Design a protein around this ligand. Sequence first.
Ligand SMILES: Nc1nc2c(ncn2[C@@H]2O[C@H](COP(=O)(O)OP(=O)(O)OP(=O)(O)O)[C@@H](O)[C@H]2O)c(=O)[nH]1
Ligand SMILES: [Mg+2]
Lengths: 171, 338
Amino acid sequence: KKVLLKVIILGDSGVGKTSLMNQYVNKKFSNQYKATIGADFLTKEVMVDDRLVTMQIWDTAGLERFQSLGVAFYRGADCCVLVFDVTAPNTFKTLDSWRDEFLIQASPRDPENFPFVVLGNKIDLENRQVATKRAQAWCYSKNNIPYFETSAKEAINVEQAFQTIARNALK
Amino acid sequence: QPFIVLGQEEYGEHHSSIMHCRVDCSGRRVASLDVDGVIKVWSFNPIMQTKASSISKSPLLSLEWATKRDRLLLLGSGVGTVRLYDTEAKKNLCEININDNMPRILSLACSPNGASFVCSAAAPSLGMNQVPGRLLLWDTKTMKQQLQFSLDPEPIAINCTAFNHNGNLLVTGAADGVIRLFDMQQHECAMSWRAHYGEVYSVEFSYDENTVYSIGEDGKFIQWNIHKSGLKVSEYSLPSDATGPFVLSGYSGYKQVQVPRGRLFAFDSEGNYMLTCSATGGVIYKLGGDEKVLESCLSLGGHRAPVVTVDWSTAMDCGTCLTASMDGKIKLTTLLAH
Ligand SMILES: Nc1nc2c(ncn2[C@@H]2O[C@H](COP(=O)(O)OP(=O)(O)OP(=O)(O)O)[C@@H](O)[C@H]2O)c(=O)[nH]1
Ligand SMILES: [Mg+2]
């Protein structure tokens, strides 16, 4: 039987949230950058221990700071995707802000076990600025959030991030 | 064209006008309740089999399948109680005492999380159902009222309720014509808007849950944007016999009248089509965006009395429409999607 999951992608502007979503669903990438304006979605069918999941993936304007969207949007959510840019340490220091802002607006009853995934995006580029150990430690401190280093450009670990939040939400 | 009609069977074990008719979450069972308080849980796959039959001494007004524990049926009485009924044991599990002075349990919604249900408890009728009411979140395994929702401005009878997919949101329609959307942990409504000049009769989330549908006493079927506080997305005027009042008349000067009490509109598995009521049988519309009129893409027929409530059970790409009418008959039309 069909199961809907709504997935929110959060993070600073330019970290690659649109790129990651388009790579997951459309499987393509564009080096040209054009800022996301409000919140909007793409939908794709995935599957999890032989049960079909309709996954509604939402893109948020990073410049908008997760602020004036609907309760209908905030409380509809079942998964949160936190994205930072490994070549940009400020995008990492804002993770606590994005996760706190999600937990305030989305307000899950069981935040500890809410399906989060953290993506250090853009590892295809050299000149990393954020140490892997440091992101691992941050993700661990928030009761062991699953951590992936990803590239929407080279399609590295996008499937793993989405599968992880899908499985853990279906629990 | 989209649907191939494979057949129509009739369930005829009720002998009074049907009030509710709902398929469980598995698709394999129906619960149906008539105005004389008779409950039937029955199968149609592979044979039309009355799996259980109760006669309630007290009036019953609403009916709702459990989601987590399918085989559990919730039944709202006219004496302020909610009965949990085990359809595989054919047995009452319990009767939860909801409210003393507001006895009409007009609506029930089981949370998809399996722990709680929301119910609507309205004062007695007598525009007869613009009286006050309560909307309560009840936590079944603690056996206590977890939350009472604020019905601004005044308490009002809630006709109809529906949960979103994760159970965080509840859309409701009241006797005063207002839709109210409630967060399951804020007692204040997250959102409300005037929706019908008249009572709201049925509400439902769209498949993708970015809009809500309502059908109202003013005869209109409206889709609302719940990301922009009930901004009308689309509006349609359904035939007069889709919202009633439903009237069965005889040569004897004896007439029965029924105001929408049950499910008025039902959807295929992903919301492209909508079953509704008519005097002759179910009428299926497509829901694409012509925006001036809805195209009537299929008509099921088969009823000699007005249809007052519908349901649409989907799996297999094999849909199964239920149409229930005032002579107590329930028709079951099986469709194949193409
Ligand atoms: N090298 C490399 N570049 C990337 C990668 N992901 C995204 N980019 C580039 O980074 C820029 C930002 O991409 P977007 O996906 O639009 O960023 P965004 O998170 O949607 O930004 P906002 O919509 O403004 O919040 C784009 O020009 C991408 O081409 C990546 O994995 N590797
Ligand atoms: Mg974006």
